[PDB]
Amino acid sequence: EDLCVANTLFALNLFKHLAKASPTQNLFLSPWSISSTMAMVYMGSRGSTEDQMAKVLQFNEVGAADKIHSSFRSLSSAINLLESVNKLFGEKSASFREEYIRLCQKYYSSEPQAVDFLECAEEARKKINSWVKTQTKGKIPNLLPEGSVDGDTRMVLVNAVYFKGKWKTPFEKKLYPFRVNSAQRTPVQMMYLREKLNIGYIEDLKAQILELPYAGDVSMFLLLPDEIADVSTGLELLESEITYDKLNKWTSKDKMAEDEVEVYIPQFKLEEHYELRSILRSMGMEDAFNKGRANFSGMSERNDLFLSEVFHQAMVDVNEEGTGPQFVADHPFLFLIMHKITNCILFFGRFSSP
């Protein structure tokens, strides 16, 4: 029983499926905002659409229908730089119920907006992009592109999230060769820090795990292969073996002990944009995206409403500003950003290519 447990299950499954589409390049997303915005769409869903969303969101694996939405509103209070903006746009002839709009306000503080996809889809496309550009203060001027919506579009969800924390201890700004793959290296600016930090070693996968705290009890956990068993990113084994139970154990206080570590990590910025429909359908959320089967009767009395697409943008800025074992991240790693009090994964990513 825990939305943050479901979120982690879902985040790892989403990352695995996403990694079929992008097996080596930089990958960065916020499982928590996808879970929360997809839960609001699931609030509007019924029948086998609902059943499938609940299963892919892992709500069923952690066991509580009438408590999900209020738990998301409570969690959002505990969790809440961390900026998250979202909006559900829907074709105006499939009118949202007054009551759905009221529940969106109440549980997700989000208001669905009607657009005219059926007759002026390009204009709708451009109104979605002005709202996004406006709410993200210029970082994303054109979230949706040229032909991502047309007369067949019925409903799209947009979600853009940005994170930049303040490290508990400032790094020192040291170009080092970062290894992208067995034939290619790219110079990166490295940041260095010597500090008492929790660090662990995963014996079976020959990798180090380190926690880098930010101020308010939000930490970055970084998983960095030690032996390199593939000629590509070197992440192949960590990515086929990570599981909920394994991550839990790797991050347990018995497996991660405090120690004076010298840390070298690149200065980096990631911005990745996704269209998750094909990813979510491969995970099992099929009916929500299928015009002949979707059931959004909770959102609208009109029969003709299905989910056309999910736009997700996530961005992180990692720099030196803050308030014995060696961890040298001069080759690819997985990382996650964790809300320690809730144990919610806010972001999850692969840094492979500077």
Swiss-Prot record:
Positions of glycan attachment: N80, N295
Example GO biological process: fibrinolysis
UniProt key word Glycoprotein: yes
A family per Pfam: Serpin
Summary of the function given for this chain in its UniProt record: Inhibits urokinase-type plasminogen activator. The monocyte derived PAI-2 is distinct from the endothelial cell-derived PAI-1.
Coiled-coil positions: none
Family: Belongs to the serpin family. Ov-serpin subfamily.
PTM summary: The signal sequence is not cleaved.
InterPro entries hit by this protein: PAI-2, Serpin_CS, Serpin_dom, Serpin_fam, Serpin_sf, Serpin_sf_1, Serpin_sf_2
Subunit structure: Interacts with PSMB1.
Disulfide bonds: C4-C344
GO cellular component labels: cornified envelope; cytoplasm; extracellular region; extracellular space; plasma membrane
Name used for this protein in its record: Plasminogen activator inhibitor 2
Keyword field contains Metal-binding: no
Compartment(s) where it occurs, according to its Swiss-Prot or TrEMBL record: Cytoplasm; Secreted, Extracellular space
Gene Ontology molecular function terms on file: serine-type endopeptidase inhibitor activity
Keywords: Cytoplasm, Disulfide bond, Glycoprotein, Plasminogen activation, Protease inhibitor, Secreted, Serine protease inhibitor, Signal
Xref: PROSITE patterns: SERPIN
SMART domains cross-referenced by the UniProt entry: SERPIN
